[PDB]
Amino acid sequence: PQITLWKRPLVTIRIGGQLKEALLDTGADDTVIEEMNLPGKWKPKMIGGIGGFIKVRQYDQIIIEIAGHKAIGTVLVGPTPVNIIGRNLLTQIGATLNF
Amino acid sequence: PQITLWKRPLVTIRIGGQLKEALLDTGADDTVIEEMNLPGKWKPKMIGGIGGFIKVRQYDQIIIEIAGHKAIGTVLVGPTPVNIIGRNLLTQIGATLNF
Ligand SMILES: CC(C)CN(C[C@@H](O)[C@H](Cc1ccccc1)NC(=O)O[C@H]1CO[C@H]2OCC[C@H]21)S(=O)(=O)c1ccc(N)cc1
Numbered sequence: 001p002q003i004t005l006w007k008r009p010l011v012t013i014r015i016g017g018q019l020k021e022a023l024l025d026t027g028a029d030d031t032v033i034e035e036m037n038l039p040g041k042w043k044p045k046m047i048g049g050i051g052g053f054i055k056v057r058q059y060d061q062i063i064i065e066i067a068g069h070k071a072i073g074t075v076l077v078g079p080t081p082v083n084i085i086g087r088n089l090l091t092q093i094g095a096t097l098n099f
Numbered sequence: 100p101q102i103t104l105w106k107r108p109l110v111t112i113r114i115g116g117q118l119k120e121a122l123l124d125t126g127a128d129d130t131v132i133e134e135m136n137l138p139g140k141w142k143p144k145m146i147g148g149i150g151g152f153i154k155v156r157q158y159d160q161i162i163i164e165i166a167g168h169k170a171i172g173t174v175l176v177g178p179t180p181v182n183i184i185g186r187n188l189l190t191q192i193g194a195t196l197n198f
Binding site for chain 2: 001049081096
């Protein structure tokens with residue numbers, strides 16, 4: 001769809017079989033999801049945002065449904081304030097900004 | 100214009116008589132600009148993201164040009180690592196996310 005920005009662009013995702021709410025976030029390079037059990041191997045990594053750096057678990061090649069569209073790619077799991085869908089997966093679902 | 104998300108969606112803005120590069124950021128409620136010496140009244144604010152919070156100065160009714168489009172609204176000024184155009188101004192320039 002076309003999504004206007006008067007409200008937060010929140011969508012439902014399915015990850016590891018579980019439904020969650022997530023924010024479509026063009027300012028995020030990477031997708032970052034709150035702490036959860038996720039099947040797959042992972043690697044320790046760190047990422048930085050506006051307020052500093054956090055530790056995350058990097059899971060590669062994770063199958064995730066975003067607003068009914070399929071993506072398969074990297075999901076960082078850790079203590080983010082908000083579940084965020086970043087450009088690595090927005091590009092997979094063909095998302096663009098338009099004005 | 101259409102902006103794909105392979106790379107960071109950076110555009111040129113003009114604020115307080117200065118040109119800067121800024122992110123078109125659907126994940127930000129508010130616009131946050133790197134420290135600059137803006138004139139006028141402001142109110143203290145703290146905003147949080149990955150890593151924690153930063154202290155910013157909230158300026159209202161600030162005129163800003165974004166990729167050639169005029170806008171006027173609230174701009175938060177503080178030690179952000181990137182200039183961020185948030186939804187408060189993205190709506191004014193008619194920006195949508197589409198997939
Ligand atoms: C976490 C979001 C809910 C909110 N943020 C906007 C978000 O787009 C930031 C915007 C952003 C961009 C770069 C640096 C800091 C913040 N991106 C971000 O944290 O992305 C992280 C995940 O991918 C990585 O790529 C960029 C940093 C990492 S935020 O910058 O913290 C923020 C919070 C409140 C306001 N008013 C404005 C911005």
